[PDB]
């Protein structure tokens, strides 16, 4: 299915290019419907290898590990103790693929606006701004469409072959953990999982009250007690960065689980987007009974985000004015 | 030739660094029993050297090796609703689409070996009691070059902004670069000397911090002719900080280079420090339990954070490998 759709993709324009991270997003069409492809070069590989078994960390004995797959070298130049050149390395679908590809199709305007390159703004969202600007947006943006994949995973067996943990009695307390769409699933250094809760009344951290703290504590404990054993303790419980996003892309409470060794894709682990789950728990001690409903939350938003023109832009200008920040002359 | 000959003789010793963000790998080894460093980096995808309309949205994908044109083989990972994702093999070629950059340092010096070593990190949960027992005595032992910059003119040629009036001898600061405007990275070092980390910020410091937030955003854009806006600066502090003298990092919100340096678990937004002081009571961050990523090379790791992390995991009922 995947292959068939990639083969029909017709290029329209380049949405974004990041040579630091080797990520690319493409706009196109499939059967005259908009489509988005995101590509990422793979990382280098390392050897995969009482009666306990310990993981061999960072070894280079196997055929495709490290630089064993070099077929061809070419020097660019050299001087003193330095040599600079280029290499071609043997690619192979099973053992050394060249790049990961994601496809969104049919892609919606929200998807295209998200992936187009755009300016970002550090916004300060007060409680009243949330009530006025964001909450009405959330209720609209709770389409059974923009969340169809979440329900697909929860109730229709989607990616069930990949699920790593599932805690469900028929109720609202259970959850499952599975590989994140971002993870290529081969390099443990980039391990990225998402925990999806079954309860539906928490759309964002704004909905977490003081009474939710013990439930959140339990999720933090379960994740760290389970995830390392799924990977033969190749990643330890203290090596998992467990976090939520505000604003999230999808308005259903989901928890991100990332190898501490991962310096991070985009904003997924960045201050201004990511908040540690441990921090969510601790902050509920100090906010009121209504919890994050009472917090003024400062975060990074893109100019293409629907909320920008829906009021965050106008409110950011007024916030800058109130803070005594100059209004930038038109002369520059 | 020579280069190829040296790479073939390289005998792997250990991995210095593996970075899945940048797709970089550094290997320590030997050649003729001398230390050598090899660095490999995946190449970026390629685009046409022409454009399809008078920034990356105008790139094109017409040439043989551009974009994903070289895909020979596809394999699905999974799919869900409108989302499909998988892996691909793409035609490689030395002249038009090489696979990776490959550099050699040989003989590499110990200075060379350092710099390339990336330490491993561990999430610790540092309570108020832990700071007083483990962290605070370490900071006191820490008695430096920072004072050379502040009071002896070091890097004065490089300073971007410096407070001078007696009025803010204490509440003032200076800003200088960290050693393309998208990659703007400045550090504000404050003139007060009693704040070594965020632990020392009290409620009474909230207004002082707000003013710093306002000064930074009012000054930096003008130093760059308003090419970056005040709301395009990611202004943050670190815990643990890189030096135990309070300082604020000022980063282009779009800086593409950065990884761990801006990550939750290390970086905290300045606005968040300000907001949290409304709730932490008079002593501020002294009362906070701070969960953050600590490095294995840090003195605090073997000084008590390791031992405390293992006990925390026991108390929380988390399985771990012992000893």
Residue numbers in the entry:
A (entry chain A): 7 to 55, 62 to 182, 185 to 346
B (entry chain B): 6 to 59, 66 to 154, 160 to 195, 201 to 344
Would you copy out the relevant sentences from the publication that reported this structure?
The complex crystallized in space group P212121, with two dimers per asymmetric unit. The final model was refined to 2.9-Å resolution with good geometry. In this structure, DcpS is in the asymmetric conformation, with the N-terminal lid domain flipped over such that the substrate is tightly embeded in the closed active site. The methylated guanine cap structure is tightly embedded in the active site and stabilized by stacking interaction with Trp-161. The second nucleotide points away from the cap structure, toward a narrow opening between the N- and C-terminal domains and fully occupies this region of the active site. This is confirmed by modeling of a capped trinucleotide into the closed active site, which shows that the van der Waals radii of a third nucleotide and residues of the exit channel significantly overlap.
In the 3′ to 5′ pathway, the mRNA body is processively hydrolyzed by the 10-component cytoplasmic exosome complex (exo-10; exo-9 plus Rrp44/Dis3), followed by the removal of the cap structure of the remaining short RNA fragment by the Scavenger Decapping enzyme DcpS (Dcs1p in yeast). The apo DcpS decapping enzyme assembles into an 80-kDa symmetric homodimer that contains dimeric N- and C-terminal domains that are linked by a flexible hinge region.
